[PDB]
């Protein structure tokens, strides 16, 4: 059918409004590069900040925190494949050290959670007789007048 469509009029490869034309257009965009994966030089443009990428990393590192490896992959992609001698600015350096600190805390304190490190899980260990009290009032600080 496709072959005969090619020799029918207004039915050439991707021209026209036929299903053969749609299929040929799909094959054409596939054969093109725009939907190919990016090179290593261009990974930190979108891919290393992608929800798909982050979720896949978290899935294939079950009980771990790949924020630091993601930072290091960004460093690699910018240094070793784009040619930047100084890939990290001050912001990225702060982010790297923040993630290092979070890794340190997670390995030091077992079960540490949100307010001290960005992390949430449900199955927690509680003493058994959990007392509930009110926070203290904010400290009266001295002030003029």
């Amino acid at each position: 059918q496709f072959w005969e469509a090619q020799f029918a009029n207004r039915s050439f490869f991707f021209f026209g409004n036929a299903w053969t034309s749609a299929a040929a257009f799909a094959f054409f965009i596939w054969w093109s590069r725009v939907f190919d994966p990016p090179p290593k030089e261009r990974l930190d443009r979108y891919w290393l900040n992608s929800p798909k990428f982050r979720i896949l990393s978290a899935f294939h590192n079950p009980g771990k925190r790949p924020g630091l490896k993601i930072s290091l992959m960004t460093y690699e992609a910018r240094y070793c494949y784009r040619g930047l001698d100084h890939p990290f600015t001050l912001n990225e350096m702060k982010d790297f050290l923040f993630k290092l600190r979070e890794q340190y805390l997670v390995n030091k304190y077992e079960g540490i959670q949100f307010p001290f490190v960005f992390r949430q899980f449900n199955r927690v260990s509680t003493p058994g007789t959990l007392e509930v009290h009110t926070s203290p009032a904010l400290q009266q600080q001295p002030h003029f007048h």
């Binding site: 199955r123 927690v124 509680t126 003493p127 007789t129 959990l130 007392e131 509930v132």
Partner: peptide, 17 residues
């Protein structure tokens, strides 16, 4: 549930989650 001041979780540890 405890008193008005010294409160506590009515549910126990295994079902608190």
């Amino acid at each position: 549930w405890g008193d008005y001041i010294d409160r506590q979780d009515n549910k126990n540890a295994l079902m608190r989650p």
